[PDB]
Amino acid sequence: SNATYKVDGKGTYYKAESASFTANYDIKTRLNGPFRSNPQSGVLHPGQTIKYDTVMKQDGHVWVVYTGYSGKRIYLPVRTWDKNSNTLGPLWGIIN
Numbered sequence: 001s002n003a004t005y006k007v008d009g010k011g012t013y014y015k016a017e018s019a020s021f022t023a024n025y026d027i028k029t030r031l032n033g034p035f036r037s038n039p040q041s042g043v044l045h046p047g048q049t050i051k052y053d054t055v056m057k058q059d060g061h062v063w064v065v066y067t068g069y070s071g072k073r074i075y076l077p078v079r080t081w082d083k084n085s086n087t088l089g090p091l092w093g094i095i096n
């Protein structure tokens, strides 16, 4: 599975890909990596748009990654992902 991704030492699938994501929900964002157990960076509120540069699959979700003003990397989950089937849930916002 995930032939177009590489894999890191934590088993996270990742790939460089750039677009914009506009949230349709309040979505909690994370520091350090694509795990809901990680520290919370904050939240995207509906209608807020970020420009991402990396896509990851980990911890039951597809995530997109961007850089905050300070240079901290911020991990935003955008839909569910089942590792054993590669099935994806509906997107939590709009990609354009």
Ligand SMILES: O=C(O)c1ccccc1O
Pocket (backbone or CB within 6 Å): 004
């Ligand atoms: O689904 C994709 O994104 C894809 C990309 C490259 C080659 C085969 C693929 O299915």
Ligand SMILES: O=C(O)c1ccccc1O
Pocket (backbone or CB within 6 Å): 026, 027, 028, 029, 036, 077
């Ligand atoms: O931001 C949320 O409430 C959330 C909900 C489901 C899964 C991951 C999440 O960050």
Ligand SMILES: O=C(O)c1ccccc1O
Pocket (backbone or CB within 6 Å): 017, 055, 062, 064, 078, 079, 088, 095
């Ligand atoms: O499945 C993907 O390749 C993908 C990439 C970016 C955002 C959401 C996604 O499902």
